[PDB]
Ligand binder design. Structure first.
Ligand SMILES: O[C@@H]1[C@@H](O)[C@H](O)OC[C@H]1O
Length: 310
């Protein structure tokens, strides 16, 4: 049986979740006898490219990529394919690429859950939509799900959208700036903020808190960062979407190994990336509110009750 090396290329380690993605996946893939190389581009596209090429040069059998920019990797991926390398897209889809497979959560469903919980908290009023990174395919999918829910209420005029901004590279500080400016331009007449992840909600909430609005404006999130959990506890963030990282990382590990033995995979979705429909496996997300923090995140050991409350 051939030895297997997996090349893992990741965006950055700024969002709390990616550390756990990387560590959990390495541990698992190593349990299955693979050697994992891992490299972080720290948000630089050209750097990502170079790192993927470094790994191709080290003759990895499988590439596991978390793209910074899902539109800039087409070429380097086709060069991998010429060399017989299997390519698995991790969490964020890569567009116009010769991908073998894609593993992620139902990201459209995530969006919808976010909006569902916010129009529950604030059924009428002024709404600000805070998109994710404009070069992450997931940011568009979150929005797409958000809208499915939000649209019927826009069209009945029960809701009014008073801003719509995407936050470059998911940075919390760019989210703060955007929210700071939004509040100003609206004279603080915003009722709800559909923010697409925890790091950016948190950005926005510091802006809200500067105006005495934290706790009074409904805001969404995802990843269940420890900080976001405590905010939900304190009444500052309405909700977050929990995405069990262990289950995703474990499945990607299993899939990496299967692609290396050329096994027939079992997809449960197919996603058109512009070049082709990519076989995909999507996990189900979980809504976390103040009531079920104990049913979900502490129950799974994602965060300990000591971390959350003490
Ligand atoms: O950056 C996003 C991250 O916060 C979310 O958890 O997973 C999808 C990514 O696009």
């Amino acid at each position: 049986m051939k030895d297997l090396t997996i090349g893992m290329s990741i965006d950055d380690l700024r969002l709390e979740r990616w550390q756990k993605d990387r560590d959990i996946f390495v541990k698992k893939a190593e349990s299955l006898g693979a050697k994992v190389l891992v490299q972080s581009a720290n948000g630089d596209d050209s750097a990502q490219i170079s790192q993927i090429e470094n790994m191709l040069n080290k003759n990895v059998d499988v590439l596991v990529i978390i793209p910074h920019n899902g539109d800039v990797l087409s070429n380097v991926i086709s060069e991998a394919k010429k060399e017989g390398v299997k390519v698995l897209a991790y969490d964020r889809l890569i567009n116009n690429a010769d991908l073998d497979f894609y593993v992620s959560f139902d990201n459209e469903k995530v969006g919808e859950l976010q909006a569902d919980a916010i129009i529950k908290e604030k059924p009428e009023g002024n709404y600000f939509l805070m998109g994710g990174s404009p070069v992450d395919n997931n940011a568009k999918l979150f929005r797409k799900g958000q809208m499915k829910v939000l649209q019927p209420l826009i069209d009945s005029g029960k809701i009014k959208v008073v801003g719509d901004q995407w936050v470059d590279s998911w940075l919390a500080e760019k989210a703060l700036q955007i929210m700071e400016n939004a509040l100003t331009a609206n004279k603080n007449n915003i009722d709800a903020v559909v923010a697409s992840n925890d790091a950016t909600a948190g950005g926005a909430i510091q802006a809200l808190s500067a105006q005495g609005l934290s706790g009074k404006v409904a805001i969404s999130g995802q990843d269940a960062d420890l900080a976001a959990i405590k905010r939900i506890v304190e009444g500052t963030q309405t909700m977050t979407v929990y995405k069990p990282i262990t289950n995703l990382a474990d499945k990607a590990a299993e899939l990496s190994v299967a692609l290396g033995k050329e096994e027939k995979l079992e997809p449960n979705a197919k996603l058109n990336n512009g070049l082709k429909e990519v076989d995909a496996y999507l996990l189900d997300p979980i809504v976390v509110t103040k009531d079920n923090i104990d049913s979900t995140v502490i129950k799974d050991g994602f965060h300990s009750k000591e971390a959350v409350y003490k």
